[PDB]
């Protein structure tokens, strides 16, 4: 994975730390919601 990290963590570091702190939170919210909805439909079809 060393080539991988040296291709996608040298340049892209100052972005994920300094700037994008606030989008990861949003992605966690996105995960929350998708979980909720998949659970709801799984429930409703488990019924039928």
Q: CB-based contacts of 24: which residues, under 8 Å, 6+ apart? A: 16
Tell which positions 9-38 bind another protein, by CB under 8 A: 11-12, 14-15, 19-20, 22-27, 29-30, 33-34, 37-38
Q: How far is the CB of 15 from another protein (least distance, A)?
A: 7
The 10 Å Cβ neighbour count of residue 44 is 9
CA distance 44 to 38: 10
Residues at the contact surface with another protein, assessed by CB under 8 A: 7-8, 11-12, 14-15, 19-20, 22-27, 29-30, 33-34, 37-38, 41
């Amino acid at each position: 994975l060393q080539s991988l990290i040296k291709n996608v963590w040298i340049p892209l570091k100052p972005y994920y730390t300094q700037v994008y702190q606030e989008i990861w939170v949003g992605m966690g919210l996105m995960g929350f919601i998708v979980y909720k909805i998949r659970s709801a439909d799984k429930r409703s079809k488990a019924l039928k």
